[PDB]
Amino acid sequence: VMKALILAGGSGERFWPLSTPETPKQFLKLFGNKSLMRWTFERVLEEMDPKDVIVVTHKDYVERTKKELPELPDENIIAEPMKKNTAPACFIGTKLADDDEPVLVLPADHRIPDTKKFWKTVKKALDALEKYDGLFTFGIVPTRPETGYGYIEIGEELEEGVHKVAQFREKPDLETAKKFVESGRFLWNSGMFLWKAREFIEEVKVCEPSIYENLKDVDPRNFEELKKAYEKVPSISVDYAVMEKSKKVRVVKADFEWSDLGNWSSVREIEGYTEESDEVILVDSDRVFVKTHNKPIAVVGLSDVIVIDTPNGILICKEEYAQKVREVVKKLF
């Protein structure tokens, strides 16, 4: 038996004017009239019973998370008192399993079209877990010097497709990322992890006692004791808090197309640049990503530009600045 832990803490700000501050990233229907989370949950339910799926998410989002995922038990959504990043959410979650039990940690914010290959990889990671223990990550081959992704160096090969992690470095500078990619000895951290519960808990004790010490005796369904416990706990990701530090990290190579729905360029990577139609007019404008609504849009003299038009507003953004659309949300509110 295994558990799945779904981390829903999203920041849909970057996706304005689709997203309002009301709709967290997780509930955005970027594809197929289905939220990121819903697609993620349907993917899990292909091989898993809802009983064994957990979602860790801030309390405001609980009531909606329930509406979105009616199959889930109520006891299975854990209400957090504060947004403390992934490490505390992982710990709190992993505690809900039996010491022995494998836990698959999954972000809600990803896109993975191939469910079967996804499970093919998970299965292959599980046998790995049983054979070698330690903490497992899923490596994606890099196609660019991305600065918001973690980077895993490949090490001693355990078996075909499975290696020890020589090192792990989260969110590096650009030129370093560039060198990692030029190297070939690195893969992107997918953001999904697999570990046995007891082992991960012991690694956090060593790696980040501040977390371990103040959360070890806590009941995740007692909101009050979890509130007061979180007051002593920091905001920090599993990656910084444990993976960079831990010497028992493993990586399996993901055999599936993967994407982090990070900002609008991200969506363009999936769909491709927009072509001229009756409602999109391009004069001296190349590599242009445009979403119309009621009326036509004309882009003149511009390239590598993103334009989005909803009832909420109109975004005109240069591609290298897609991450700064969050700032639009600071100013506009």
Ligand X SMILES: Nc1nc2c(ncn2[C@@H]2O[C@H](COP(=O)(O)OP(=O)(O)O[C@H]3O[C@H](CO)[C@@H](O)[C@H](O)[C@@H]3O)[C@@H](O)[C@H]2O)c(=O)[nH]1
Subset of residues 98 to 137 that bind ligand X, contact rule: CB under 6 A: 107-109
Closest listed residue to residue 263, CA positions, set 23, 12, 22, 32: 12
Distance, CA of 214 to CA of 147 (rounded, Å): 32
Q: How many CB atoms lie within 10 A of CB 260?
A: 17
Indicate whether 263 belongs to the interface with ligand X (CB under 6 A). no
Indicate whether 276 belongs to the interface with its own copies (CB under 8 A). yes
Exactly one of 21, 148, 209, 313 binds ligand X (CB under 6 A); that residue is 148
Indicate whether 106 belongs to the interface with its own copies (CB under 8 A). no
Tell me the residue length of the chain: 333
Indicate whether 148 belongs to the interface with its own copies (CB under 8 A). no
Indicate whether 44 belongs to the interface with ligand X (CB under 6 A). no
Indicate whether 22 belongs to the interface with its own copies (CB under 8 A). no
Indicate whether 275 belongs to the interface with its own copies (CB under 8 A). no
Amino acid letter, residue 97: A
Indicate whether 266 belongs to the interface with ligand X (CB under 6 A). no
For the chain, give the residues followed by a break (C–N over 2.5 Å): none
Residue 214 corresponds to which tokens in the numbers above? Answer: 């103040």
- Give the shortest CB-309-to-its own copies separation in angstroms: 7
Exactly one of 260, 269, 304, 319 binds ligand X (CB under 6 A); that residue is 260
Closer residue to its own copies, CB minimum distance, 85 or 292: 292
Exactly one of 3, 43, 84, 268 binds ligand X (CB under 6 A); that residue is 84
Annotated binding site for Mg(2+): 109, 260
211 binding partner (options Mg ion, ligand X, its own copies, none; Cβ < 5 to 8 Å by kind): none
Indicate whether 267 belongs to the interface with its own copies (CB under 8 A). no
* Site stretch for its own copies (CB under 8 A), options 99-107, 148-156, 176-184, 319-327: 319-327
Indicate whether 13 belongs to the interface with Mg ion (CB under 5 A). no
Amino acid letter, residue 135: L
Indicate whether 145 belongs to the interface with ligand X (CB under 6 A). no
Indicate whether 228 belongs to the interface with ligand X (CB under 6 A). no
Closer residue to its own copies, CB minimum distance, 236 or 328: 328
Q: 16 and 328 in contact (C-beta within 8 Å)?
A: yes
Amino acid letter, residue 27: F
Distance, CA of 328 to CA of 318 (rounded, Å): 13
Q: What angle do CA 32, 36, 37 make, to 5 degrees?
A: 125
β-pairing verdict for 77-80 and 53-58: parallel
Percentages of the chain per state (helix, strand, coil), in multiples of 5: 35, 30, 35
Distance, CA of 34 to CA of 47 (rounded, Å): 20
Exactly one of 28, 30, 56, 252 binds ligand X (CB under 6 A); that residue is 56
Indicate whether 123 belongs to the interface with its own copies (CB under 8 A). no
Looking at the DSSP bridge assignments, the partners of residue 210 are none
Note the residues at the interface with Mg ion (CB under 5 A): 109, 260
